[PDB]
């Protein structure tokens, strides 16, 4: 017998109840703007499949960000565009403003609202305890929204969280790996960056769901409260699961594998070994203790579970005591 099937615990059937066109991105027709509306100002960075520029919309003098795509399959471009349009206006989701066809690369360029980001390798060292709770809450708003809209991001990590700290403004970016959740669908496990890959990806369990994003969120939270980046520091995808197991223990890993009848790549047998589940205090020291509290550790523990079905949902996460002060302040 093969692996046991799985279904999302929440938002299971939201796409089924939508018109086909909502999620059937292969049939999406792209609406193009005018490439001449935009003049590039300077290069801001790069993606795996893109180069990113600051630009000016010369018809209204608005600053925008332009993501010029490298060669990608057209259906993957349609997928990113369709997801961005479906999610437009949702809390802390980057706003796709336009789509143009670049004359030089002959490739598409996605035009986004401008965000004045502070690089997290500089920002995260300055955040307070309250700042971490605040920005985690804002990320959760974006994730609960996209999950409720039938979409999993699949690439949650600090590089994909833009923060204008001066204005306490956050946007979740780079929807190029995001996918629609359909119950029973088996997904590509070659997604997300190594340090943020969930155990389901590392053991090749394909019937995963929104809860993948919650593992990644827990990896980010751990790196921020312990000031250890990355938290799970694997040398490759196999060693990545070893690093997780040295913290979460091997017992719950093998229980997870047994529960879903997952056939474990034989290369894992010689490297996983046997490891106890460690206490989070092992990562607390004088340089990070001001960011670590009983509430933070309780919240973290409920995100970082092997069994994707047992992780907090984004909505459950937002109701955790860790956020009580944030929730109370946002009410006034
Ligand atoms: C300091 C620069 C601010 O950066 C912005 C601002 C607004 C919108 C986006 C970005 C952006 C996007 C994407 C990428 N950046 C950056 C990290 C270089 C990297 C590759 C993937 C990607 O999509 C935006 O969508
Ligand atoms: Cl659009």
Short mmCIF file of C-alpha atoms and ligand atoms in Angstrom, two decimals:
data_model
loop_
_atom_site.label_atom_id
_atom_site.label_comp_id
_atom_site.label_asym_id
_atom_site.label_seq_id
_atom_site.Cartn_x
_atom_site.Cartn_y
_atom_site.Cartn_z
CA UNK A 1 0.00 0.00 0.00
CA UNK A 2 1.11 3.59 -0.64
CA UNK A 3 1.01 6.72 1.52
CA UNK A 4 -2.11 7.57 3.52
CA UNK A 5 -3.99 10.51 1.94
CA UNK A 6 -4.37 13.84 3.71
CA UNK A 7 -6.73 16.82 3.56
CA UNK A 8 -6.35 20.36 4.82
CA UNK A 9 -7.91 20.82 8.26
CA UNK A 10 -9.37 24.22 7.25
CA UNK A 11 -10.40 25.87 4.00
CA UNK A 12 -10.53 22.39 2.53
CA UNK A 13 -13.04 22.92 -0.29
CA UNK A 14 -12.95 26.67 -0.92
CA UNK A 15 -11.70 26.30 -4.50
CA UNK A 16 -14.25 23.62 -5.36
CA UNK A 17 -17.01 26.09 -4.47
CA UNK A 18 -15.47 28.78 -6.73
CA UNK A 19 -16.04 29.09 -10.47
CA UNK A 20 -13.50 27.10 -12.46
CA UNK A 21 -11.85 30.29 -13.72
CA UNK A 22 -10.76 31.24 -10.19
CA UNK A 23 -8.18 28.43 -9.93
CA UNK A 24 -7.84 27.10 -13.51
CA UNK A 25 -4.92 29.39 -14.24
CA UNK A 26 -3.91 27.51 -17.39
CA UNK A 27 -6.90 29.11 -19.09
CA UNK A 28 -6.13 32.59 -17.74
CA UNK A 29 -5.65 35.32 -20.35
CA UNK A 30 -3.11 37.94 -19.23
CA UNK A 31 -4.18 41.60 -19.37
CA UNK A 32 -1.19 43.64 -20.60
CA UNK A 33 -0.42 47.28 -19.90
CA UNK A 34 1.90 49.64 -21.78
CA UNK A 35 5.62 49.04 -21.24
CA UNK A 36 6.23 52.68 -22.22
CA UNK A 37 4.44 53.88 -19.09
CA UNK A 38 7.52 52.84 -17.06
CA UNK A 39 11.14 53.98 -16.93
CA UNK A 40 13.56 51.90 -14.87
CA UNK A 41 15.56 53.85 -12.28
CA UNK A 42 17.92 51.36 -10.66
CA UNK A 43 18.37 47.70 -9.88
CA UNK A 44 17.07 46.52 -6.51
CA UNK A 45 17.84 42.81 -6.54
CA UNK A 46 17.30 39.41 -8.08
CA UNK A 47 15.14 36.33 -7.75
CA UNK A 48 15.72 32.79 -8.89
CA UNK A 49 13.73 33.64 -12.03
CA UNK A 50 13.76 37.43 -12.14
CA UNK A 51 15.58 40.73 -11.82
CA UNK A 52 13.92 43.47 -9.80
CA UNK A 53 14.11 47.22 -10.45
CA UNK A 54 12.84 50.47 -9.06
CA UNK A 55 10.90 52.36 -11.72
CA UNK A 56 8.79 55.44 -12.33
CA UNK A 57 5.34 55.35 -13.86
CA UNK A 58 5.78 58.43 -16.05
CA UNK A 59 2.05 58.94 -16.61
CA UNK A 60 1.48 59.74 -12.92
CA UNK A 61 5.04 59.98 -11.46
CA UNK A 62 4.38 57.04 -9.11
CA UNK A 63 7.34 55.01 -7.84
CA UNK A 64 6.83 51.32 -8.61
CA UNK A 65 8.82 48.10 -8.46
CA UNK A 66 9.29 46.09 -11.67
CA UNK A 67 10.04 42.35 -11.66
CA UNK A 68 11.41 41.32 -15.05
CA UNK A 69 11.03 37.57 -15.52
CA UNK A 70 13.65 35.15 -16.80
CA UNK A 71 12.32 32.34 -19.04
CA UNK A 72 9.57 30.53 -17.11
CA UNK A 73 6.83 28.28 -18.45
CA UNK A 74 3.86 30.42 -19.45
CA UNK A 75 1.49 28.43 -17.22
CA UNK A 76 3.67 29.30 -14.22
CA UNK A 77 3.52 32.96 -15.18
CA UNK A 78 -0.27 32.70 -15.50
CA UNK A 79 -0.36 31.02 -12.09
CA UNK A 80 1.56 33.84 -10.36
CA UNK A 81 -0.53 36.51 -12.07
CA UNK A 82 -3.81 34.75 -11.33
CA UNK A 83 -2.89 34.31 -7.67
CA UNK A 84 -1.76 37.94 -7.37
CA UNK A 85 -5.01 39.15 -8.92
CA UNK A 86 -7.12 36.83 -6.74
CA UNK A 87 -5.38 38.10 -3.60
CA UNK A 88 -5.24 41.78 -4.57
CA UNK A 89 -6.44 44.01 -1.74
CA UNK A 90 -5.94 41.35 0.94
CA UNK A 91 -4.14 42.38 4.14
CA UNK A 92 -0.36 42.73 3.75
CA UNK A 93 -0.38 41.10 0.28
CA UNK A 94 1.82 42.90 -2.26
CA UNK A 95 -0.32 44.72 -4.85
CA UNK A 96 0.21 43.83 -8.49
CA UNK A 97 -0.33 47.10 -10.34
CA UNK A 98 0.37 46.19 -13.96
CA UNK A 99 1.79 43.57 -16.32
CA UNK A 100 3.85 44.59 -19.34
CA UNK A 101 5.92 42.82 -21.98
CA UNK A 102 9.56 43.94 -21.81
CA UNK A 103 10.85 44.89 -25.28
CA UNK A 104 14.44 43.74 -24.74
CA UNK A 105 13.97 40.45 -22.89
CA UNK A 106 10.65 39.89 -24.74
CA UNK A 107 9.58 38.48 -21.36
CA UNK A 108 6.86 39.70 -19.02
CA UNK A 109 7.51 42.26 -16.33
CA UNK A 110 5.25 42.41 -13.29
CA UNK A 111 4.72 45.90 -11.84
CA UNK A 112 4.17 46.15 -8.09
CA UNK A 113 3.38 48.80 -5.51
CA UNK A 114 6.59 50.25 -4.09
CA UNK A 115 7.80 49.18 -0.62
CA UNK A 116 10.85 50.73 1.08
CA UNK A 117 12.42 47.58 2.51
CA UNK A 118 15.01 47.29 5.27
CA UNK A 119 17.23 44.26 4.58
CA UNK A 120 16.47 41.70 7.29
CA UNK A 121 20.17 41.00 7.90
CA UNK A 122 20.22 44.61 9.21
CA UNK A 123 16.64 44.97 10.49
CA UNK A 124 16.21 41.78 12.52
CA UNK A 125 19.12 42.65 14.86
CA UNK A 126 17.25 45.80 15.99
CA UNK A 127 13.70 44.46 16.47
CA UNK A 128 12.26 44.45 19.99
CA UNK A 129 10.12 41.73 21.55
CA UNK A 130 7.03 43.77 20.69
CA UNK A 131 8.23 44.33 17.11
CA UNK A 132 8.54 40.59 16.51
CA UNK A 133 5.03 39.92 17.83
CA UNK A 134 3.68 42.79 15.73
CA UNK A 135 5.24 41.72 12.44
CA UNK A 136 4.47 38.04 13.04
CA UNK A 137 0.85 39.04 13.56
CA UNK A 138 0.90 40.97 10.26
CA UNK A 139 2.36 37.98 8.40
CA UNK A 140 -0.37 35.80 9.91
CA UNK A 141 -3.01 38.19 8.55
CA UNK A 142 -1.61 37.66 5.06
CA UNK A 143 -1.40 33.89 5.46
CA UNK A 144 -4.87 33.46 6.92
CA UNK A 145 -6.14 35.56 4.03
CA UNK A 146 -4.44 33.63 1.24
CA UNK A 147 -5.26 30.27 2.84
CA UNK A 148 -8.91 31.32 3.15
CA UNK A 149 -8.69 32.22 -0.55
CA UNK A 150 -7.52 28.69 -1.38
CA UNK A 151 -3.85 29.52 -1.93
CA UNK A 152 -0.66 28.35 -0.25
CA UNK A 153 2.41 30.54 -0.59
CA UNK A 154 5.01 27.71 -0.31
CA UNK A 155 8.01 30.07 0.00
CA UNK A 156 7.58 31.89 3.29
CA UNK A 157 10.96 33.21 4.49
CA UNK A 158 12.47 36.55 5.60
CA UNK A 159 13.60 37.46 2.06
CA UNK A 160 9.93 37.35 0.96
CA UNK A 161 8.69 39.63 3.75
CA UNK A 162 9.20 43.30 2.92
CA UNK A 163 9.14 45.59 5.94
CA UNK A 164 9.03 49.39 5.86
CA UNK A 165 9.93 49.64 9.53
CA UNK A 166 9.59 53.43 9.72
CA UNK A 167 5.91 53.06 8.71
CA UNK A 168 5.35 49.64 10.37
CA UNK A 169 4.22 48.37 6.96
CA UNK A 170 4.71 44.76 5.88
CA UNK A 171 4.04 43.00 2.56
CA UNK A 172 4.34 39.31 1.70
CA UNK A 173 5.98 39.12 -1.74
CA UNK A 174 7.12 36.63 -4.42
CA UNK A 175 4.08 34.54 -5.20
CA UNK A 176 5.98 32.68 -7.93
CA UNK A 177 5.83 29.35 -6.06
CA UNK A 178 2.30 29.71 -4.71
CA UNK A 179 -0.35 27.15 -5.71
CA UNK A 180 -4.06 26.53 -5.33
CA UNK A 181 -5.03 23.94 -2.72
CA UNK A 182 -7.27 21.13 -4.01
CA UNK A 183 -8.10 18.16 -1.76
CA UNK A 184 -6.29 15.05 -2.97
CA UNK A 185 -3.87 16.87 -5.24
CA UNK A 186 -0.24 15.79 -5.05
CA UNK A 187 2.18 18.72 -5.26
CA UNK A 188 5.81 19.17 -6.21
CA UNK A 189 7.97 18.81 -3.12
CA UNK A 190 10.86 20.75 -4.73
CA UNK A 191 9.59 24.08 -3.40
CA UNK A 192 10.76 26.58 -0.76
CA UNK A 193 14.33 27.37 0.31
CA UNK A 194 16.27 24.63 2.09
CA UNK A 195 16.17 26.13 5.58
CA UNK A 196 12.39 26.63 5.49
CA UNK A 197 11.28 23.34 3.88
CA UNK A 198 8.72 21.45 5.92
CA UNK A 199 9.27 17.81 6.87
CA UNK A 200 6.59 16.79 4.35
CA UNK A 201 8.82 18.15 1.59
CA UNK A 202 11.94 16.48 2.97
CA UNK A 203 10.34 13.01 3.21
CA UNK A 204 8.57 13.44 -0.17
CA UNK A 205 4.98 13.45 1.04
CA UNK A 206 3.15 15.10 -1.83
CA UNK A 207 -0.42 15.57 -0.50
CA UNK A 208 0.41 18.64 1.59
CA UNK A 209 -1.57 21.84 2.16
CA UNK A 210 -1.60 25.31 3.76
CA UNK A 211 0.09 23.95 6.88
CA UNK A 212 3.37 23.96 4.93
CA UNK A 213 3.40 27.76 5.31
CA UNK A 214 3.03 27.41 9.07
CA UNK A 215 6.21 25.31 9.35
CA UNK A 216 8.11 28.00 7.44
CA UNK A 217 6.64 30.68 9.67
CA UNK A 218 7.87 28.76 12.72
CA UNK A 219 11.36 28.57 11.21
CA UNK A 220 11.35 32.35 10.80
CA UNK A 221 10.05 32.91 14.32
CA UNK A 222 12.75 30.69 15.79
CA UNK A 223 15.46 32.55 13.90
CA UNK A 224 14.16 35.90 15.17
CA UNK A 225 13.61 35.14 18.85
CA UNK A 226 16.84 33.12 19.19
CA UNK A 227 18.91 35.36 16.85
CA UNK A 228 20.07 32.24 14.99
CA UNK A 229 19.79 32.48 11.20
CA UNK A 230 18.99 30.00 9.83
CA UNK A 231 17.56 28.05 12.74
CA UNK A 232 17.71 24.65 10.97
CA UNK A 233 21.04 24.85 9.12
CA UNK A 234 21.19 21.87 6.76
CA UNK A 235 23.97 21.27 4.23
CA UNK A 236 21.54 19.70 1.74
CA UNK A 237 17.96 18.48 1.70
CA UNK A 238 18.86 15.22 3.47
CA UNK A 239 20.90 16.91 6.19
CA UNK A 240 18.10 19.47 6.57
CA UNK A 241 15.87 16.75 8.01
CA UNK A 242 18.73 15.63 10.26
CA UNK A 243 19.04 19.16 11.67
CA UNK A 244 15.29 19.22 12.38
CA UNK A 245 15.45 15.78 13.99
CA UNK A 246 18.29 16.84 16.28
CA UNK A 247 15.85 19.37 17.78
CA UNK A 248 12.38 17.80 17.42
CA UNK A 249 13.71 14.28 18.07
CA UNK A 250 13.59 11.17 15.92
CA UNK A 251 10.72 9.48 17.79
CA UNK A 252 8.04 11.89 16.55
CA UNK A 253 9.57 11.76 13.06
CA UNK A 254 9.22 7.99 12.77
CA UNK A 255 5.71 8.18 14.25
CA UNK A 256 4.90 10.74 11.54
CA UNK A 257 6.32 8.46 8.85
CA UNK A 258 4.40 5.49 10.25
CA UNK A 259 1.14 7.45 10.47
CA UNK A 260 1.13 8.40 6.79
CA UNK A 261 2.83 5.17 5.60
CA UNK A 262 5.58 7.24 3.99
CA UNK A 263 8.35 5.28 2.31
CA UNK A 264 11.53 6.92 3.51
CA UNK A 265 14.37 7.35 1.01
CA UNK A 266 16.91 4.69 2.08
CA UNK A 267 19.67 7.32 2.21
CA UNK A 268 17.99 8.60 5.38
CA UNK A 269 18.52 5.36 7.31
CA UNK A 270 22.25 5.92 7.85
CA UNK A 271 22.09 9.62 8.77
CA UNK A 272 18.97 10.26 10.89
CA UNK A 273 20.21 8.19 13.82
CA UNK A 274 18.43 8.57 17.16
CA UNK A 275 17.95 11.95 18.83
CA UNK A 276 15.91 13.09 21.79
CA UNK A 277 13.50 16.00 21.56
CA UNK A 278 15.36 19.03 22.93
CA UNK A 279 14.05 21.80 25.15
CA UNK A 280 13.96 25.30 23.68
CA UNK A 281 15.94 26.68 26.63
CA UNK A 282 19.00 25.17 24.93
CA UNK A 283 18.87 28.09 22.46
CA UNK A 284 18.32 30.87 25.04
CA UNK A 285 21.29 32.98 26.13
CA UNK A 286 22.12 36.48 27.34
CA UNK A 287 21.96 37.98 23.84
CA UNK A 288 18.41 36.84 23.01
CA UNK A 289 16.60 36.31 26.34
CA UNK A 290 14.82 39.66 26.00
CA UNK A 291 13.06 38.24 22.91
CA UNK A 292 12.14 34.86 24.45
CA UNK A 293 9.17 34.35 26.77
CA UNK A 294 7.05 31.36 27.85
CA UNK A 295 4.40 32.57 25.39
CA UNK A 296 6.86 32.73 22.50
CA UNK A 297 8.14 29.21 23.20
CA UNK A 298 4.63 27.76 23.54
CA UNK A 299 3.62 29.39 20.24
CA UNK A 300 6.80 28.21 18.48
CA UNK A 301 6.34 24.64 19.67
CA UNK A 302 2.83 24.55 18.21
CA UNK A 303 4.11 25.59 14.76
CA UNK A 304 7.11 23.24 14.53
CA UNK A 305 5.42 19.83 14.38
CA UNK A 306 6.35 17.05 11.95
CA UNK A 307 2.68 16.12 11.46
CA UNK A 308 1.36 18.94 9.27
CA UNK A 309 -2.18 18.21 10.49
CA UNK A 310 -1.19 19.09 14.09
CA UNK A 311 0.35 22.56 13.40
CA UNK A 312 -1.63 25.66 14.31
CA UNK A 313 -3.67 27.18 11.52
CA UNK A 314 -2.99 30.82 10.77
CA UNK A 315 -6.25 31.75 12.49
CA UNK A 316 -5.43 29.66 15.57
CA UNK A 317 -1.98 31.23 15.63
CA UNK A 318 -3.48 34.74 15.73
CA UNK A 319 -5.47 33.82 18.85
CA UNK A 320 -2.38 32.64 20.80
CA UNK A 321 -1.45 34.51 24.04
CA UNK A 322 1.80 35.62 22.38
CA UNK A 323 -0.28 38.21 20.46
CA UNK A 324 -2.58 39.47 23.26
CA UNK A 325 -0.77 42.80 23.54
CA UNK A 326 -0.74 43.28 19.76
CA UNK A 327 -4.44 42.43 19.48
CA UNK A 328 -5.33 44.83 22.30
CA UNK A 329 -3.31 47.68 20.77
CA UNK A 330 -4.82 47.22 17.31
CA UNK A 331 -8.30 47.53 18.85
CA UNK A 332 -7.66 51.15 19.90
C1 LIG B 1 14.41 46.80 -1.16
C2 LIG B 1 13.66 46.40 -2.18
C3 LIG B 1 12.16 46.20 -2.14
O1 LIG B 1 11.71 45.10 -2.96
C4 LIG B 1 10.41 44.95 -3.41
C5 LIG B 1 9.45 45.98 -3.22
C6 LIG B 1 8.14 45.84 -3.67
C7 LIG B 1 7.74 44.66 -4.35
C8 LIG B 1 8.69 43.65 -4.54
C9 LIG B 1 10.04 43.77 -4.08
C10 LIG B 1 10.72 42.49 -4.49
C11 LIG B 1 9.86 41.60 -5.16
C12 LIG B 1 10.58 40.42 -5.50
C13 LIG B 1 11.90 40.59 -5.02
N1 LIG B 1 11.97 41.86 -4.40
C14 LIG B 1 13.19 42.49 -3.73
C15 LIG B 1 13.51 41.75 -2.41
C16 LIG B 1 14.42 42.52 -4.65
C17 LIG B 1 13.00 39.52 -5.17
C18 LIG B 1 12.69 38.39 -6.21
C19 LIG B 1 11.22 37.98 -6.26
C20 LIG B 1 10.22 39.15 -6.18
O2 LIG B 1 9.12 38.94 -6.65
C21 LIG B 1 8.53 42.28 -5.23
O3 LIG B 1 7.53 41.85 -5.69
CL1 LIG B 2 -3.36 43.17 -13.26
#
